[PDB]
Amino acid sequence: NVIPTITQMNLKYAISAKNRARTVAGVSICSTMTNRQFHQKLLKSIAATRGATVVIGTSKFYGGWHNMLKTVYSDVENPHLMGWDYPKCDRAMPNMLRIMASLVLARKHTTCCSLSHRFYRLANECAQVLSEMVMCGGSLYVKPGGTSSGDATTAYANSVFNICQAVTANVNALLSTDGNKIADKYVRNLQHRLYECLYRNRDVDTDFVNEFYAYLRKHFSMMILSDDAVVCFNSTYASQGLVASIKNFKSVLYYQNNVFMSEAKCWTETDLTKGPHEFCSQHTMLVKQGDDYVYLPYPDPSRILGAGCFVDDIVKTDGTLMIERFVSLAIDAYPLTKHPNQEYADVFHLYLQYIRKLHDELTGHMLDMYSVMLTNDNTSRYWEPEFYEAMYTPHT
Amino acid sequence: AVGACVLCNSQTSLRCGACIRRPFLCCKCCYDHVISTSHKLVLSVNPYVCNAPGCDVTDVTQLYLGGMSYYCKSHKPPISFPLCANGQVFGLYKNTCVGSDNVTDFNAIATCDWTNAGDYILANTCTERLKLFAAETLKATEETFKLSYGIATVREVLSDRELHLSWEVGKPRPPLNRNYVFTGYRVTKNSKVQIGEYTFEKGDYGDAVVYRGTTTYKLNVGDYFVLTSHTVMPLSAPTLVPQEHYVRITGLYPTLNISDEFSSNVANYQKVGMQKYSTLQGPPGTGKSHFAIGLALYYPSARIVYTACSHAAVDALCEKALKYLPIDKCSRIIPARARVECFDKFKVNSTLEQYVFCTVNALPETTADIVVFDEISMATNYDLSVVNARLRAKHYVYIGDPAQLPAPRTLLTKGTLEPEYFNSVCRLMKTIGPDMFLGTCRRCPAEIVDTVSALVYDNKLKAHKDKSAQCFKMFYKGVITHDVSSAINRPQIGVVREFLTRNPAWRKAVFISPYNSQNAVASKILGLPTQTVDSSQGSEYDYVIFTQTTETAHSCNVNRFNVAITRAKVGILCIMSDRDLYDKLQFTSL
Amino acid sequence: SKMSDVKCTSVVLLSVLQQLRVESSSKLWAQCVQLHNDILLAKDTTEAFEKMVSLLSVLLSMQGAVDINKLCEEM
Amino acid sequence: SSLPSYAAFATAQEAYEQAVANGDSEVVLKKLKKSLNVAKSEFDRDAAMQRKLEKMADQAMTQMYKQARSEDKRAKVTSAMQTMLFTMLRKLDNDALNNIINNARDGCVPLNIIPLTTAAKLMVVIPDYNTYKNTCDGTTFTYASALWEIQQVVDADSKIVQLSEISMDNSPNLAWPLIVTALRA
Amino acid sequence: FSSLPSYAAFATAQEAYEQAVANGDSEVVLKKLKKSLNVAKSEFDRDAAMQRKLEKMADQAMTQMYKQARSEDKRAKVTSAMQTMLFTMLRKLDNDALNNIINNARDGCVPLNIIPLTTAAKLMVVIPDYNTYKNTCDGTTFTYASALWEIQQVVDADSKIVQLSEISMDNSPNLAWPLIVTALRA
RNA sequence: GCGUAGCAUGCUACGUCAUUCUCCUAAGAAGCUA
RNA sequence: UAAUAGCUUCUUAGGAGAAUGACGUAGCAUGCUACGC
Numbered sequence A: 001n002v003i004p005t006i007t008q009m010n011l012k013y014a015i016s017a018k019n020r021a022r023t024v025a026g027v028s029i030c031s032t033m034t035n036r037q038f039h040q041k042l043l044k045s046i047a048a049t050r051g052a053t054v055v056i057g058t059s060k061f062y063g064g065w066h067n068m069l070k071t072v073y074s075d076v077e078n079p080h081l082m083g084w085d086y087p088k089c090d091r092a093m094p095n096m097l098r099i100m101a102s103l104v105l106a107r108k109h110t111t112c113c114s115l116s117h118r119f120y121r122l123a124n125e126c127a128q129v130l131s132e133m134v135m136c137g138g139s140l141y142v143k144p145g146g147t148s149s150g151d152a153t154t155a156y157a158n159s160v161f162n163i164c165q166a167v168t169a170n171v172n173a174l175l176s177t178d179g180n181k182i183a184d185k186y187v188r189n190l191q192h193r194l195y196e197c198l199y200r201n202r203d204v205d206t207d208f209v210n211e212f213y214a215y216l217r218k219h220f221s222m223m224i225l226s227d228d229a230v231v232c233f234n235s236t237y238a239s240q241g242l243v244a245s246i247k248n249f250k251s252v253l254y255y256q257n258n259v260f261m262s263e264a265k266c267w268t269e270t271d272l273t274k275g276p277h278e279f280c281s282q283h284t285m286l287v288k289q290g291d292d293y294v295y296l297p298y299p300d301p302s303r304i305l306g307a308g309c310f311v312d313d314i315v316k317t318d319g320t321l322m323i324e325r326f327v328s329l330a331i332d333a334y335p336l337t338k339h340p341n342q343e344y345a346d347v348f349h350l351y352l353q354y355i356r357k358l359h360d361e362l363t364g365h366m367l368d369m370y371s372v373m374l375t376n377d378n379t380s381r382y383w384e385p386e387f388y389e390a391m392y393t394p395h396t
Numbered sequence B: 001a002v003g004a005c006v007l008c009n010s011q012t013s014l015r016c017g018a019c020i021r022r023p024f025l026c027c028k029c030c031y032d033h034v035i036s037t038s039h040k041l042v043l044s045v046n047p048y049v050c051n052a053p054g055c056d057v058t059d060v061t062q063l064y065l066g067g068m069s070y071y072c073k074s075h076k077p078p079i080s081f082p083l084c085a086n087g088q089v090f091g092l093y094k095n096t097c098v099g100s101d102n103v104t105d106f107n108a109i110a111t112c113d114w115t116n117a118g119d120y121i122l123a124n125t126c127t128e129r130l131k132l133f134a135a136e137t138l139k140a141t142e143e144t145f146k147l148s149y150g151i152a153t154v155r156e157v158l159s160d161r162e163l164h165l166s167w168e169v170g171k172p173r174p175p176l177n178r179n180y181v182f183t184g185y186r187v188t189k190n191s192k193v194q195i196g197e198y199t200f201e202k203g204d205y206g207d208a209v210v211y212r213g214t215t216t217y218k219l220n221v222g223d224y225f226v227l228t229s230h231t232v233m234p235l236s237a238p239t240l241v242p243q244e245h246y247v248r249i250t251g252l253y254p255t256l257n258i259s260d261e262f263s264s265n266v267a268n269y270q271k272v273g274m275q276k277y278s279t280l281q282g283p284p285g286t287g288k289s290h291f292a293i294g295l296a297l298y299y300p301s302a303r304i305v306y307t308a309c310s311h312a313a314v315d316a317l318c319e320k321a322l323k324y325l326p327i328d329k330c331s332r333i334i335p336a337r338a339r340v341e342c343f344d345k346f347k348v349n350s351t352l353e354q355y356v357f358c359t360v361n362a363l364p365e366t367t368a369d370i371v372v373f374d375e376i377s378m379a380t381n382y383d384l385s386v387v388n389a390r391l392r393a394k395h396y397v398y399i400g401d402p403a404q405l406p407a408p409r410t411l412l413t414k415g416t417l418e419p420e421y422f423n424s425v426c427r428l429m430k431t432i433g434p435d436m437f438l439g440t441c442r443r444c445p446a447e448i449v450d451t452v453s454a455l456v457y458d459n460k461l462k463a464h465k466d467k468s469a470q471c472f473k474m475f476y477k478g479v480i481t482h483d484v485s486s487a488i489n490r491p492q493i494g495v496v497r498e499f500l501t502r503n504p505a506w507r508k509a510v511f512i513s514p515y516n517s518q519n520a521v522a523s524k525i526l527g528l529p530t531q532t533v534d535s536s537q538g539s540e541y542d543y544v545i546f547t548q549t550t551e552t553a554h555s556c557n558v559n560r561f562n563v564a565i566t567r568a569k570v571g572i573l574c575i576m577s578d579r580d581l582y583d584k585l586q587f588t589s590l
Numbered sequence C: 001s002k003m004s005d006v007k008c009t010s011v012v013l014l015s016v017l018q019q020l021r022v023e024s025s026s027k028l029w030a031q032c033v034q035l036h037n038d039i040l041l042a043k044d045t046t047e048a049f050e051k052m053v054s055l056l057s058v059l060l061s062m063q064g065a066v067d068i069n070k071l072c073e074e075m
Numbered sequence D: 001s002s003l004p005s006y007a008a009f010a011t012a013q014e015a016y017e018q019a020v021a022n023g024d025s026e027v028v029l030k031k032l033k034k035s036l037n038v039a040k041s042e043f044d045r046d047a048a049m050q051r052k053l054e055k056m057a058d059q060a061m062t063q064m065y066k067q068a069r070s071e072d073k074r075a076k077v078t079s080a081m082q083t084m085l086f087t088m089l090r091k092l093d094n095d096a097l098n099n100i101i102n103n104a105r106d107g108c109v110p111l112n113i114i115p116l117t118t119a120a121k122l123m124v125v126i127p128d129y130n131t132y133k134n135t136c137d138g139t140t141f142t143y144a145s146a147l148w149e150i151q152q153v154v155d156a157d158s159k160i161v162q163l164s165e166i167s168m169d170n171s172p173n174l175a176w177p178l179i180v181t182a183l184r185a
Numbered sequence E: 001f002s003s004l005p006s007y008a009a010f011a012t013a014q015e016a017y018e019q020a021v022a023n024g025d026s027e028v029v030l031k032k033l034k035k036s037l038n039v040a041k042s043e044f045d046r047d048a049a050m051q052r053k054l055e056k057m058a059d060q061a062m063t064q065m066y067k068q069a070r071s072e073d074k075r076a077k078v079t080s081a082m083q084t085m086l087f088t089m090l091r092k093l094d095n096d097a098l099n100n101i102i103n104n105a106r107d108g109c110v111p112l113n114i115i116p117l118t119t120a121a122k123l124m125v126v127i128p129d130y131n132t133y134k135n136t137c138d139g140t141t142f143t144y145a146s147a148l149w150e151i152q153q154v155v156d157a158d159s160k161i162v163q164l165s166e167i168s169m170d171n172s173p174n175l176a177w178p179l180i181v182t183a184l185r186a
Numbered sequence F: 001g002c003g004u005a006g007c008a009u010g011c012u013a014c015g016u017c018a019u020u021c022u023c024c025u026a027a028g029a030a031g032c033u034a
Numbered sequence G: 001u002a003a004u005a006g007c008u009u010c011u012u013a014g015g016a017g018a019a020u021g022a023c024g025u026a027g028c029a030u031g032c033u034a035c036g037c
């Protein structure tokens, strides 16, 4: 049976760098419960795999960022890093691509579900997520399409959509090349068989699908987190048109997403010793840790200072009540101490000194409210930089 | 649960358990209070009783903080330490508590039963925080005195309009009037539960009470009544907001030719505008409450809240405002129960109107541009703190006179209270003097004012009328019937009845007597509007018949008699008891 | 630090206005929100100060809301 | 550590120390070792319950402090925010902000939002001739560190009053406070 | 612990041991009584362990029972709330118009999006500016969804009543847009 | 030489307690990301 | 009014395990001594 569902639109009260309002989709429990029961095994299996294309469940601490970046550079020949942007990603996504993502996620149910069971699960997904009734200010509207950001499988379906767009860009790049200019005889035959498998074949050719997958993994290595993507592509092939470039992504998003991807939000890095320019809002820098060089992610110092200065509750302003609040921010701001800019390195020391001042005045206020100090105080380790240095060391 | 010490405003977490109001006390102040008085119970976030399996020790010098709780001398964990020691009492914020020297007046305020007179003169000349605490505990004691009134029951019912009463043997009997209510019981087997809210009033013949109820339940003989209790709320605002003298009028605006009648009080209006709060003291019927309405006509745009402690005074003020102010922009705020019948001619109970009249007790939290408190003699420091808390304002004006009758003060029964200790406002009036003062009687005739300028005021008032010779002083013995616990003088009422058909122009004179019992029972025998002396204050009538019921210290009170006679407008007949009181006034023969 | 002192003062000012139930009047709250957001998204100090004058005029226009004399005598 | 079980353990340890200083042989030495162990075990149990009790004391202290401070901070949210706002306003020391605040203290507050566009309308109430004399020079009006052209002066009766009628002698009969409508120049 | 007779056995063994030590009993009897006291205390603490487990599992069972009773008395409340909501929504229905449009259906099935559009008796129009107001519902009556509606009320974004004379080209800046107009089907 | 009894030393099993560590779960507070 | 998912910090409680130490009991191995054969 198909259960239609109403999803609320909730305004998001959080810190941001732009003044446009952000809205999330609160989906009903009747949809979330069944979508969990349908997808959670695969979703937890994706979140527990290390070294794959979809980096979900991979921590950035204890060398997780360095491991991710070393898996992206998986033996590519002339590596250049690339990153693109999806403008209006959750609201311009076509219904065909969302249905594609839902059908790709549902390929794991080849034994537990029948054909009709999988169809009615897809229909429930479409009725509750894709084209639903939306409660926006006490009024029911119809959502025209696009993914809602509150379903159970949001980041994972978004990752499927991102991988699909990248594969489409590579297919278009390889097919739109001349063919008489391709010097490599292997890539010319690959293009010929790609056209055969696209427009002259109706049954799946698993041998060529494996061959093209191997080609993409060899020359177009990817790292996907649901709309962020780092690619470590072969620069020579991409210059010859044998592998997708930024212009191919722009073309694909123009004719398949109904958006224009300006090249001012897409970055290219010719030097691997600097890492990706930005992935998950973190810049990357190569530091000498211990005796070897590793990649550490540092955030925008403006973001950390804004999180310290502006809060969403009146009781987060006391400071002495929230020392863990600043310990977490110092954990996030630790890699700034390796930045060559001293004003960036001073943010971590500022947070450590504020933690020490907060503990000093907390102990003063506690000794005032009583006449005895606390017997056990282990707060001294939060203004020592070793507690935060061990946060980015691969021993754990 | 922390707070501020009452007499030093340091931080604290201790309270005195034995005190009725349970006030916060810092460590030094709490030690000073408990080591010297008989109060030996201190409530922290947890009470300081001993936490044995079963033990009842409350004295704080006996206890220790042992293990994780407060334990007595021979129940403590072997590891101590003493609570009440080192010149302090152990509590939160222990090493920031500065004591005081006001732990000598606070002991007297907490200990005293408000029976003597000196307790009031120490409860009104102390510091500002103690002025609030003393008023709070005085109201608490006045409320808890009602708990000692005898439990009632019903004898039988021959007539369903007049209940029969039976008090419990061995307890005092409360007075029967409108101010006191009752709530019942049916405790036979079988419903120890309330049976409604009733009220009583005595009957003239035999033993009977012509009752009233909120519902229509009958009493099977086991059903009975007990007087309920009014819990007293805490108060925070100062009794008087501190005064500041502005250079020029701020927040108020004058008018264009205010009137031809209020042209004399213009300087006092400007003085009111200049100062933060002002006090107007004048003999009765000289233009005090007709000064407030003139002030309203002088500051037309200013929102004004008029308030008073009584209902029959604010009703007279409402009538005067209706006579003068535009009636469209007025109000009248009444309590939910509305025990007395209030003034229903304006749009009643609309707080957000420009001119708003209310009693002190029913004041709603709001703002204003000037608040006019009236008849401050009736008001205690509780009323001043209430009006200073609920109503924010830019300018305050207190109008009233100390020589009129003060607040009831039911607990006071020894000695007399001088005017300068009625409340803070009267103390200010008598100590340094009023800010505005107008002595010239514009209401009462020449004879009654020329006699009242000998009783209370030391030959101060000239006045303006002609003595119409309708001021009468009667000689009549007036035998006593102490019936309702307030006296009734049947033969004096008989004198009035036998000489109210001989006075064709006196058919509408209001009947005034100090005792509410005779004042209420007179309605059958003569039919005139009736009024007690306490509520007659602030209201004028064209003709007054005053009857001194019995010779006592209540009816022979010069303040009460002076506020009684001076409500007349053209003539007054009064029958007297005291050979002195009838002789000190100069009236006609009879 | 003068540009960043203006951007925090506007945050506190709009918090005060929200506490004073300016949010109930949608036409006034829209202008207050516009001024606050344009102060936060500012590169020039003079523009931010002009918009701060306009935003403080909302607080100063309501007579019965705040006690200016008491607030300015605590400094 | 000033407790009974530590007194027993300490005197047993001192007795064993003296005995092992003598330490001849052998059964008394082993029995004293066992007595030291059995006293130490009871002292250690007492110390463990002591530490459990003091850990729960610290739990209670921290929790009560957090509750008290949180309720105190949430209680005083309006006055604290207003005091913080005016502290920050004073620290800025802008000449326009100081001007409008000083006028607001006198009561010369605006009736609408002060406009930024040129030739836009400002309505401001002036409550006395003192505030008019400083701010208004001729037909010019100085406010918010800016010059405005006076357009229309009215009273609380909404009666139009000419700029010639505002003086030391005629205004004391007028219907103050005036309301001045001006345009940004 | 104290209820069980293991404490009694320990207490009598300890009393006998102390009495014989004070009486100067021989070394063999002293060792015998020491061994008996040791095994008595062993049984005592061994059963005290079972008592610890008893009280621990009893408190866990009681907490589980309290939680289950609470979650079963909170289920009935939401069941009743859902039932009352559903039945009030039933009572809101325009039964005659809905019956007509549902009997006109061939299969008895109709799109949901036409259920208000053909049966709702009240229409709420939210209008952001004056040009839109002039276009869609100017005047006291207008046409929408092939039906005739009569304006019964107009409010602003502040939920304050606005009169139709106040919605003008020059009075538009003084109105708190958007305006919500409520009309009834004629 | 054997049996019984006692003392001392050592190993194993079990029960109880103290300390430290690891993990598994539950509950709560918080931070960041998409 | 406040979504899905991931990671991390801190605190509390419960269970299980490990390690070390302490006591008690039982079993086994050895040395010395007393009695009987």
Ligand SMILES: Nc1ncnc2c1ncn2[C@@H]1O[C@H](COP(=O)(O)OP(=O)(O)O)[C@@H](O)[C@H]1O
Pocket (backbone or CB within 6 Å): B261, B262, B264, B283, B284, B285, B286, B287, B288, B289, B290, B291, B442, B443, B538, B539, B540
């Ligand atoms: N300026 C005046 N001219 C004439 N009569 C006046 C004037 N002021 C007051 N009165 C009269 O004097 C009386 C005083 O009344 P009121 O102010 O209520 O006295 P009190 O305040 O003592 O109760 C009023 O009834 C009024 O008629």
Ligand SMILES: [Mg+2]
Pocket (backbone or CB within 6 Å): B285, B288, B289, B290, B538
């Ligand atoms: Mg009067």
Ligand SMILES: [Zn+2]
Pocket (backbone or CB within 6 Å): B016, B017, B018, B019, B033, B039, B110
């Ligand atoms: Zn006391």
Ligand SMILES: [Zn+2]
Pocket (backbone or CB within 6 Å): B005, B006, B007, B008, B009, B010, B025, B026, B027, B028, B029, B030, B097, B098, B099, B100
């Ligand atoms: Zn004190």
Ligand SMILES: [Zn+2]
Pocket (backbone or CB within 6 Å): B050, B051, B052, B055, B056, B057, B071, B072, B073, B074, B075
């Ligand atoms: Zn005890």
